[PDB]
Design a binder for this molecule. Structure first.
Ligand SMILES: *[C@@H]1O[C@H](CO)[C@@H](O[C@@H]2O[C@H](CO)[C@@H](O)[C@H](O)[C@H]2NC(C)=O)[C@H](O)[C@H]1NC(C)=O
Ligand SMILES: *[C@@H]1O[C@H](CO)[C@@H](O)[C@H](O)[C@H]1NC(C)=O
Length: 49
């Protein structure tokens, strides 16, 4: 239950925008916050969250 173990833990992740791991989100209208990104590391961080 590592899903239940880390609640109430707002964490801050930084990254570098050069990779195919993170190269924003492909859409006509830009989103904001964590939802404006996509890639290997972004959906990987969504999987880990
Ligand atoms: C986040 O905070 C809430 C506050 O309600 C926690 O909920 C309680 O968590 C404890 C265990 O830490 C349980 O024993 C209680 O039954 C829960 N409810 C009550 C009555 O508060 C929640 O678990 C916390 N989440 C974390 C820290 O991961
Ligand atoms: C996590 O907790 C849930 C309770 O809803 C339980 O069903 C599940 O088996 C737990 N996960 C592990 C790996 O024990």
């Amino acid at each position: 239950n590592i899903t239940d173990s880390l609640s109430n833990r707002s964490l801050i992740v930084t990254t570098i925008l050069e990779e195919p791991y993170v190269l924003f989100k492909k859409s006509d209208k830009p989103l904001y916050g964590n939802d404006r990104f996509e890639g290997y590391c972004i959906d990987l961080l969504r999987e880990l969250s």
